[PDB]
Amino acid sequence: EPTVPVNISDLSIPPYSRLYLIFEGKNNVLLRSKVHAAPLKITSAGEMQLSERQWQQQEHIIVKPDNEAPSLILSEFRRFTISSDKTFSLKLMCHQGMVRIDRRSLSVRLFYLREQPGIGSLRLTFRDFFTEVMDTTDREILEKELRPILIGDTHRFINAAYKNHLNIQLGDGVLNLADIVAEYARIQKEETAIMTTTVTTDSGELDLSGRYKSVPMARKADTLYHLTPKGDLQIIYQVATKMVNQAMIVSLPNYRHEWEKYNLSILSEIPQNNNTVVHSILRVNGPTMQVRTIDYRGTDENNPIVSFSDTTFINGEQMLSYDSHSSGRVYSREEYMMWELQQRVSEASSARTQDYWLMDAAVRNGEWKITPELLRHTPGYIRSTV
Numbered sequence: 001e002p003t004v005p006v007n008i009s010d011l012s013i014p015p016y017s018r019l020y021l022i023f024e025g026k027n028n029v030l031l032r033s034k035v036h037a038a039p040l041k042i043t044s045a046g047e048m049q050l051s052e053r054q055w056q057q058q059e060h061i062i063v064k065p066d067n068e069a070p071s072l073i074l075s076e077f078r079r080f081t082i083s084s085d086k087t088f089s090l091k092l093m094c095h096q097g098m099v100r101i102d103r104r105s106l107s108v109r110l111f112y113l114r115e116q117p118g119i120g121s122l123r124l125t126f127r128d129f130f131t132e133v134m135d136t137t138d139r140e141i142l143e144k145e146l147r148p149i150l151i152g153d154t155h156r157f158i159n160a161a162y163k164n165h166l167n168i169q170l171g172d173g174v175l176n177l178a179d180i181v182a183e184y185a186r187i188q189k190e191e192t193a194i195m196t197t198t199v200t201t202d203s204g205e206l207d208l209s210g211r212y213k214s215v216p217m218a219r220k221a222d223t224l225y226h227l228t229p230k231g232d233l234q235i236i237y238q239v240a241t242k243m244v245n246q247a248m249i250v251s252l253p254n255y256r257h258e259w260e261k262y263n264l265s266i267l268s269e270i271p272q273n274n275n276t277v278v279h280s281i282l283r284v285n286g287p288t289m290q291v292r293t294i295d296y297r298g299t300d301e302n303n304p305i306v307s308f309s310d311t312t313f314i315n316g317e318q319m320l321s322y323d324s325h326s327s328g329r330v331y332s333r334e335e336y337m338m339w340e341l342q343q344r345v346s347e348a349s350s351a352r353t354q355d356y357w358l359m360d361a362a363v364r365n366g367e368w369k370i371t372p373e374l375l376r377h378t379p380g381y382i383r384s385t386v
Contacts, residue, residue, distance in 0.1 A: 030368075032360075035316075036060075039125075045070055052076040055122065056114070064127045069165045072124070077170035080111035080119055082224055082236070082321070088245040090180070094187040095194050095249070096226055096234055099180055103137055104130035108180060110170075111319055119319045126162070126177065133157045144192070150185040154178045198251035201261045208283065210263025215248055218277070219268045221324040225289055227313055231256030233284070240271050252284070259286050260361050260373050270324070272298075285377065286357045288312040288350060291322070308336035312350035344381070 003022050008031075013019050023029045039060040042048065045068035055061070055074045063072065081089040093099065098109040107125040114120050134157065136142050149156060155163055155178060166178045195216055204211030220238035227233060233252035239245070250266060266282040276299075281292040293307045308331040311322050322328075331339060344351040358378060362370055 030359075030363075032363075042070060042072075047071050047073065049073045049075060056120070059121070060123045060125065062125045062127065065159075065161045067161065069128075069162045071165045071167075071169075073169040075169075075171055077110075077173070078113040079170050079173050079175075080113055080319070080321075082222065083245055083247075085245055088247075090183050091187065091194060092236070092247055094180070094184045096236075097228060099184045101137065101184070104128065104132075104135055106130065106177075106181065108177070118315070118317055119321060121318060124168070128159055129162055129177075131157050131159050144189075147185045147189055150182050154182045193246060195246065195248040196251065197248065198253065199264060200253070201258065201264075204264050208265045208281070210265065212265055212267060213250075214267040215250065217246075217248065218271050219248070219280070221270060223291075223322045223324065225311070225313075225320045225322075227256070227318050227320075229318060230254075235266070235282070237268065255284075256357075256360075257364075259284070259357065260377060263376075285310075286361075287353050289320075289322075306333065307331060308333060310336075312353055314349040314353050 006021075011019060037057075037059040039062045040058045042061065042063045043066050045065075048070040050073065052075060055077070061072075063070065083089045083092070100107045100109075105125055105127045106129040107123060110122045110124065112120050112122065134143060134146055146157065155166075158166070158178060158181070166176060168175045168177060197213075197216065199213055202211075204213040206212070215237060218240045220240045222238065224236035225233065226236060231254055233250075233255040235250040235252075237248045237250070239248065252262070255262070262284055264284065266284075268280045268282070270278050270280055272278055277296070278298055279294040279296045281294060283290040283292065288310050289312070290308070290310045293309075295304045295306075297304055309322075309328055311320050313320055358374070361374060362368060
């Protein structure tokens with residue numbers, strides 16, 4: 001049968017199906033695409049249990065009470081937290097932007113560990129959550145006036161249909177959504193503890209050709225790189241002091257759309273148990289976060305041992321974790337470069353993501369052009385037969 005025409009800006013593929021697109025073979029086909037799984041709408045009331053594979057399928061779970069609200073339950077939800085404390089990861093999650101608000105809809109983004117490598121994601125949107133008081137969210141003055149109410153009596157302005165279902169079972173964890181709402185108000189008032197140091201293309205002092213920037217204090221072993229869908233980088237560190245939990249952020253606004261203009265390196269010092277300070281150098285290379293550790297005369301003299309490592313965002317993730325205590329492998333410079341080439345040869349996902357970022361960057365102006373700005377970041381590649 002003659003082929004059917006379809007608008008390329010919106011395609012629907014039903015479960016366990018495919019959709020063959022037919023292209024002309026004279027020109028070159030360059031198709032940029034984005035995938036959004038269809039949301040699951042929920043309107044009933046009462047208990048609502050979703051099995052592991054039931055909430056693992058979905059990406060955005062909308063809740064739209066008609067009369068009453070369900071008691072959302074997501075079994076086997078191994079929630080991802082970087083701090084074992086329960087009142088500090090709340091501040092950090094509110095700070096990264098994982099709690100959003102518009103009109104009367106409150107949206108919360110979650111995370112979870114899974115058997116497959118990496119960290120998953122999931123969004124819950126609680127429509128009808130808010131009453132008519134803050135239907136005027138456009139004005140900042142009215143929201144600021146309503147902020148003090150959210151501290152003591154948060155339930156005053158929450159819709160009555162949601163009052164008895166303000167907690168979301170997550171397996172072994174209970175997340176009081178009213179608590180989330182209350183704490184987001186404190187975070188917004190503070191914005192208008194967690195230290196903030198945003199860098200830009202031309203921010204920072206002058207192999208690491210470019211700019212240098214050093215965090216305010218001495219970090220911990222673990223590190224967290226957060227990439228919001230808008231395309232900003234939110235490198236997460238710690239303070240190496242168990243007395244007070246103080247994560248220090250490094251914000252790189254509009255990173256995904258400007259990763260070729262960044263020639264910046266980040267220096268940090270991780271203290272060790274033996275009263276030895278180990279330096280750490282972080283170099284952003286597109287989606288691959290190159291980490292260089294310099295022992296800096298830790299046990300040697302004048303010839304510090306240098307270990308290379310990196311973690312690359314893959315499969316559209318928005319949160320990557322590196323422990324520096326249990327997971328990793330020692331790599332010298334030549335060994336690391338050789339390993340990168342070996343990963344590229346076997347078509348590993350990191351190389352594919354690097355290529356995706358490069359092809360995205362090449363078409364910035366609209367017309368395909370490999371400008372010289374990308375001739376420094378990109379290592380060349382040659383295949384030959386002997």
